[PDB]
Design a binder for this molecule. Sequence first.
Ligand SMILES: C[C@@]1(F)[C@H](O)[C@@H](COP(=O)(O)OP(=O)(O)OP(=O)(O)O)O[C@H]1n1cnc2c(=O)[nH]c(N)nc21
Ligand SMILES: Nc1ncnc2c1ncn2[C@@H]1O[C@H](CSCC[C@H](N)C(=O)O)[C@@H](O)[C@H]1O
Length: 262
Amino acid sequence: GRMLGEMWKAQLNQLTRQEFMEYRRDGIIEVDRSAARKARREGNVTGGHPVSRGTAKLRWMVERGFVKPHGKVIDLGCGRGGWSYYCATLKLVQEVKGYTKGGPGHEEPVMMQSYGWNLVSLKSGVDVFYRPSEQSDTLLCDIGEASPVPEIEEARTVKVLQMVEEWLSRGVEDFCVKILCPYMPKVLKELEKMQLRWGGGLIRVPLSRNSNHEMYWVSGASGNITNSVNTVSQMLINRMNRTNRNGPKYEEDVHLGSGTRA
Ligand SMILES: C[C@@]1(F)[C@H](O)[C@@H](COP(=O)(O)OP(=O)(O)OP(=O)(O)O)O[C@H]1n1cnc2c(=O)[nH]c(N)nc21
Ligand SMILES: Nc1ncnc2c1ncn2[C@@H]1O[C@H](CSCC[C@H](N)C(=O)O)[C@@H](O)[C@H]1O
């Protein structure tokens, strides 16, 4: 038998494009980024606007205690830097190192002056899958590229977990790791072993789009992995089958201020 999430992916792939676009943001929470997009086009780096939607997703988890960034934070796949700049605003964070691939088709780090920007060092041109691990107090990873083929998303997710395993073995106190495809067998098998060793649990951020099944493995959660994943699959399938669509529920984006930290 298959996990319900496999069903969801098959049904997702059968939507027309118009159906898909009507579904992907139906009933999710979305922060309004109109001012942020104007800020990046105007080079406004002091207005507190996050560089991406990712900031609001990590804020959601941090304010619920699912991860408590502190000390030295390493941000794997930092992209423009939304997670890294957010952590540098936090009282217990002392240093943020972000690594991302960059180059054609990939986001380059953006230089911002949000609060605590001077604690952030972002490095492009870095393939984290071949980078030696380093010590960290907080380990973040937001990597996982979508595909219509669930076996490709499965393999991509397993590769992330095998990399994270090396970084966690350095001794990490807090973590938050994107699980792109949590319902496929090879991901479940690996995650269950890694939960046994390192703890944590899977959570679904309601800012995630209905067009993906992404969940985050976070140190400040617990709970059965199979049940957590199934709960998300049923929600996403329920939303796909309720065809009176409303678009997202809008909320306010994070304000990251400006200024250096001592
Ligand atoms: C093919 C996919 F399965 C993608 O593998 C997944 C994520 O496609 P996506 O790039 O939007 O990812 P998403 O936006 O959710 O994630 P974030 O940006 O928040 O990180 O949706 C499906 N998909 C994309 N386009 C279409 C489409 O035209 N028609 C249909 N039927 N399915 C589509
Ligand atoms: N092998 C790899 N090594 C390093 N970065 C990678 C990678 N594969 C993908 N990435 C990067 O992972 C990034 C995920 S971006 C995630 C959003 C980010 N947390 C924010 O808040 O802005 C992408 O920019 C992508 O280019």
